[PDB]
Design a protein around this ligand. Structure first.
Ligand code: S8H
Ligand code: S8H
Lengths: 306, 306
């Protein structure tokens, strides 16, 4: 019945986006309860970015130097503080649209939706993964900083990403909502470069199970393998090593399809060595790795939110 | 700075989704002002679907036989009528969350976002195109009928698709909001099968311009061609014929990149004949055709909505 890269409905987060201007820098912030979260580099000019001293740059800032606009209303800033690489701007009015929410730091391989924003206004929504090198492959232009990533489980919004930087290679880096960068990146315009972008093996496997459900089965070979032998072939193709926990997590997909996880590993092996010879799997000629096992289950059964 | 399949923020449409039950059939409807739109096959059982007589099946239905639930509130139905293949259920209260909106019938090759719903609740959001054979390649399971497709231009929601059917081949068919199917499909469970799924040439070209902007340029060959000669090669590869209007529409992308449209056509020709030899363009090993020229411009400049 089809399988698609699908983000969470975004309406909940839309009503949390505001515009933050400090000096001549404008970007997005996240208004939850009576606090606005935003990247601390809002206080930097374009000169300041090669070597910012954030503590020093902050000294010359007062509550009234952060202008925060929701649609066309100014919120009054009644306090502000730096936490790691984010600013938390206390405002005098709780967002009436605040959802049930929490802050989560996700693991590499985990997926989430990004609401890309400019000047506090939503532009669009798409699904990302936290790559193993702790970048993400997004779509962000000047002024997108402060856009967030999230997951939704029923009525509860889990915020896991804030956008801060684009590296020379055009991939993207950012923090959790406590202001800690994912990976080794820093909010400085310097020589920092991403490591090997390895493939999230367990997510590829999840997606092959997804394909089987939806009718693409040509790749279902007639072998099985072992974790150790499969990983010797994953290594050379820059695939993340597959663990027993990963096997466990696929157990549900294994049980719905009747195909043992190691059998699927054998099929994947043969795809890595022999190619797809021009074939397609769910309308991709590449092996997709930004679906989690939970994503597959969700989409193939119809889990809802509100 | 990255390029991604990106849907419109969905919050506006979320607040229009309700649950419609008639008899033992439940699906989604769209509540705008004091009217709820939904697929007329809500009134059919699973037996009724091989050969429904909708006019006859409707005779035994009254306003009180349609139960409409918004979250956990019942709307009172004060009138109902069939329009083509949709029912319009007049309710006694205007949706207070109704956006500025209009109904548009889109052309093949045009793109839109789908908010997939189950039991009146949002499940996720993704971007589709109206294919030239008038199917779409979505993600829809039992109970997703009534989910809608839309575009947003600033504050105005243009609804263009309602989901009704999944064909034996696992692609999807549906109507505009006036209840007219796209293409030759009917709301009957019979032998109807999609035609040739040709590729939307102009959108492929748009996406190559997108790639050039974002750094992927290896395919920029050193030829040019003519519309007529390029189309003789598009034909055999089941590509939609390229017209002058299509050339005109790419004019803006041509001007930003400095690459003439016919030069891009020559590059595409060479890709169709020689393949991608394992290379990638914007992280696809296939030529993508569900971005419009307007989509590219939008995303590469940062157009916002609210
Ligand atoms: S987000 C819903 C919930 N948070 C949790 O307890 C997380 C565990 C599950 N995801 C769940 O039970 O939903 C909650 O009540 N959050 C309220 C809230 O706004 O918390 C903020 C930290 C203030
Ligand atoms: S949707 C905004 C507008 N509709 C138009 O006039 C379409 C042309 C442009 N997209 C635009 O000007 O935005 C409008 O005022 N719609 C109001 C509305 O709800 O209309 C329904 C038909 C009732």
């Amino acid at each position: 019945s089809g399988f698609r890269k699908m983000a969470f409905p975004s309406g909940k987060v839309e009503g949390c986006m505001v515009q933050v201007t400090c000096g001549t820098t404008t970007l997005n912030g996240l208004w939850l309860d009576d606090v606005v979260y935003c990247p601390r580099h809002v206080i930097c000019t374009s000169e300041d970015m090669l070597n910012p001293n954030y503590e020093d740059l902050l000294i010359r800032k007062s509550n009234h130097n952060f202008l925060v606009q929701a649609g066309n209303v100014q919120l009054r800033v009644i306090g502000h503080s730096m936490q790691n690489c984010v600013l938390k701007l206390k405002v005098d009015t709780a967002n009436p649209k605040t959802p049930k929410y929490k802050f989560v730091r996700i693991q590499p391989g985990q997926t989430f939706s990004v609401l890309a924003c400019y000047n506090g206004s939503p532009s669009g929504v798409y699904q990302c993964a936290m790559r193993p090198n702790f970048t993400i492959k997004g779509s962000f232009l000047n002024g997108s900083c402060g856009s967030v990533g999230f997951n939704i489980d029923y009525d509860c919004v889990s915020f896991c990403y804030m956008h801060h930087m684009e590296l020379p290679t055009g991939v993207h880096a950012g923090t959790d909502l406590e202001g800690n960068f994912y990976g080794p990146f820093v909010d400085r315009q310097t020589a920092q470069a991403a490591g090997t972008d390895t493939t999230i093996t367990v997510n590829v496997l999840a997606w092959l199970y997804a394909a089987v459900i939806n009718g693409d089965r040509w790749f279902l070979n007639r072998f099985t393998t072992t974790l150790n032998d499969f990983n010797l072939v994953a290594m050379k193709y820059n695939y993340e090593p597959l663990t027993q926990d990963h096997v466990d997590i696929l157990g549900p997909l294994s049980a719905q399809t009747g195909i043992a996880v190691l059998d699927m590993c054998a099929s994947l092996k043969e795809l890595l060595q022999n190619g797809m010879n021009g074939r397609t799997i769910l309308g991709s000629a590449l092996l997709e790795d930004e679906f989690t096992p939970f994503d597959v289950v969700r989409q193939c059964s119809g889990v809802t939110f509100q």
